[PDB]
Structures are given as C-alpha cells and as structure tokens.
Amino acid sequence: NYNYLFRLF
Amino acid sequence: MIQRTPKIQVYSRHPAENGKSNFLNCYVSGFHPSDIEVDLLKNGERIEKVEHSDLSFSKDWSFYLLYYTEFTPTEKDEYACRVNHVTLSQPKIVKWDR
Amino acid sequence: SVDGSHSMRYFSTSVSRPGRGEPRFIAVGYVDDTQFVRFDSDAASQRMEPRAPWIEQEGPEYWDEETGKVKAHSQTDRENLRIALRYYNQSEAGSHTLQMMFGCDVGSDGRFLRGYHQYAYDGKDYIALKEDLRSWTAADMAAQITKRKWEAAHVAEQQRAYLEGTCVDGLRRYLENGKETLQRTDPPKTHMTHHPLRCWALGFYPAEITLTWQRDGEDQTQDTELVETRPAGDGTFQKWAAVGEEQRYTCHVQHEGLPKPLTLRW
C-alpha cells in the first residue's frame, strides 16, 4: 500500500 | 556535486560454458546519476535484444541495474559488456571471464 | 533477516529532463529482496503494474487506488524539483535527481517495528523522518526551510499514521499471500577453483550472506578479494571470495538458508 499524502518542500 | 562511477560485473546466470541455456548479465551498481548505457557485446558486436530491470537504489542512494539477454553458452563464444556513464571519459568494456 | 523481521520498501526516483519535457519518474516496490510493483512515467499504461505473481491476487480496486497515489507522488516531486532549484539557487538547464524512500518493518510475529521516510537531492541526504517518527533531520540550510514548514504543518503525525497503519497492514497481507514464495530460503551452492583460488556461492536467497577466509583456522583479511552480492535474474543472488601457497586455507560461508556454516575443501 503506497502512501496517500505527499507534501512540498 | 558528487558523481559516483559505476561498478561493473558481467557474468553468467547459471553455471555453464556448453550447450545449456543460461542468461548473460551485466550488473552495474553504485553509480550516480541514473543515466547509464549498458551494451552487451558478442565478439565486438552489440546484441540487439538486451532487457534490464527497473531502476532502484541502495542505502547510500546509489543506483543499481541488471541488464540481461537470454543465451545458450558455447565453449568458444565470447561475450562482453560496454558501459558508458558521465563519469567515464571513454566507454569501459569488461569481457566475460569465468 | 535472522531476527525474522520482514520489510516493505517503496523507492522513487525523479530525474528532470530540461528541454526534453517533464521529469522521468520511476517508483519501485520491494518486500524484503523481492520486487512486487513498479511505476514508470514513460510507460503507456500510466498505472501501477505488477512484478510478482502474488500481488496479482489483489483486488481490482487496489490497482486503481495505488495508481492514484504514485501519480500524486510523481506530480508532487516535480514541483519539489523546482523548489530545490530556488532553495539552492540553481539554473533550469541542469538535470537533477530527487529520490525518496519510505516503508515499514515488522517482526516475525508481524508487529510494527520501524518506519522510514527520507529524501535525497542529487544523491545526498535532504531530509529524513527520525526514528521517533516525530522529528526531522535536515542535512543543509535548504532542508532547514522545508523542516520548519513540515513542523508547522505537522507532517510527521500524518506520516506516522501511515507507517504504523496502512503500511504494516499491506506488508502482512503480502507476506501471507506470498508465503509459498516470501517466507522461504535458498541455500548457496558452494564450489572452489584455482589459478596460478576462490569460493563461489550461487543461487541463494535472501542476499544477506557472509564469505570468510581462514588459514589454519585463523581469520584472513589480507590477500582476500570479495565482490558485492549480485543478482542472477531469477530471484537468487551470487557472490564469490578469493585469496604455490595452498591447501592451508579454507573458505567459510554463512547464510540464514544454510543448515550449518560451510567450509570449503580446496
């Protein structure tokens, strides 16, 4: 299961 | 930035030098960045069908790739691997040994 | 490994293609040393694809949902590649690489052990979630800017939930469905050669292996050559060790798939 939240730097 | 030179290993999949099907492999590892050219060579001529695994990397973030072509080794037939990378002034050619 | 622990890892690479279009995104998924999924932005499917027989036993909702999450990653790291240019005052003509690793560890019993969430820019550490899954390790002044933002937005909590939850739930399921394949070992095939000598371990899984040289029962480090473990292409791995003067030396091979550590008769 991949992650569902990705953030910017 | 820090560019890492590729580590090259050309080798046979299963043990063989005679009529028994195997796979010729050129495993490149420990390099950065990812743009790399791997050519399997038969007596100096590029083998046309050479597949490779999906790009992945190690704990130090350096990449590794395995290039392979299906083959049936014979006693006399010679093979090689040609690898070019940004860290390489000229293509490096490693010949299959044992 | 010997602990009996099992691990799920997702590796992602983004390489910007200046003047040649949008960046290339490759994402690969591994359970221990066996890959099971992949996603390549250059591929026509534009969807998460299987690479192990036991992941195809998953439902069809899985492949749609997993595709949506890896595509979000690829699109998110495309802006992050551009943010890095501003943080480091670099030009739009250079090719740069952004790498991410995330995943979790479980034990032999399947309980949560560790979590991972790290980034690298151009092959060197950018930012990492620390082992407490609550604080961040920033490697340079650029990552300090990102660390402050991720502390204000409380990103650690949102990741810690995934690592302890959805992450381990999947690893368990993949381990059980791949029981016939994942919870097994391949012992090395040992053999030795001589040249005016070296031991060979072939066809072993997992890749964790140790090759030792002892002369007359004493550890030998000098005149010894050990190459990195290599894949054969069939899911197993290979490694060899080497050192007139002869007969007095012995090669000792240790592996979690070996009933006993092996000693090689020259």
Author numbering:
A (entry chain C): 1 to 9
B (entry chain B): 0 to 97
C (entry chain A): -2 to 193, 201 to 247, 252 to 274
Reproduce text from the manuscript describing this model.
Here, we studied an HLA-A24-restricted NYN epitope (Spike448-456) that elicits broad CD8+ T cell responses in COVID-19 patients characterized by a common TCR repertoire. The HLA-A24-restricted NYN epitope (Spike448-456, NYNYLYRLF) elicits strong and broad CTL responses in antiviral immunity. Four natural mutations, N450K, L452Q, L452R, and Y453F, arose within the NYN epitope and have been transmitted in certain viral lineages. Our findings indicate that these mutations have minimal impact on the epitope's presentation by cell surface HLA, yet they diminish the affinities of their respective peptide-HLA complexes (pHLAs) for NYN peptide-specific TCRs, particularly L452R and Y453F.
To elucidate the basis of the mutant peptide presentation by HLA-A24, we determined the structure of Y453F-HLA-A24 (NYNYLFRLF) at a resolution of 2.5 Å. Clear and continuous electron densities extend across the entire length of the MHC-bound peptide, allowing confident identification of all peptide residues. The structure revealed the strong bindings between HLA-A24 and the Y453F peptide. The peptide backbone was bound to HLA-A24 via seventeen hydrogen bonds and an additional salt bridge between Lys170 and P9-Phe of the peptide. The most substantial deviation occurred at the central portion of the bound peptide, where the α-carbons of mutation site P6-Phe shifted by 1.7 Å. Both the WT and Y453F peptides were anchored to the HLA-A24 cleft through a conventional orientation involving nine hydrogen bonds and one salt bridge formed by P1-Asn, P2-Tyr, P7-Arg, P8-Leu, and P9-Phe with HLA-A24. Interestingly, compared with the WT peptide, the Y453F peptide establishes more bond interactions with HLA-A24 helix via P2-Tyr, P3-Asn, P4-Tyr, P6-Phe, P7-Arg, and P9-Phe, forming eight hydrogen bonds with E87, T97, T167, Q179, Q180, and T187. The solvent-exposed side chains of P4-Tyr, P5-Leu, and P7-Arg of the peptide were positioned away from the peptide-binding groove, composing a moderate surface for potential interactions with TCRs. Compared to WT-HLA, both mutant L452R-HLA and Y453F-HLA exhibited enhanced stability, as evidenced by increased melting temperatures. Structural analysis indicated that the Y453F mutation may induce a non-functional conformation, compromising the interactions between epitope and peptide-specific TCRs.
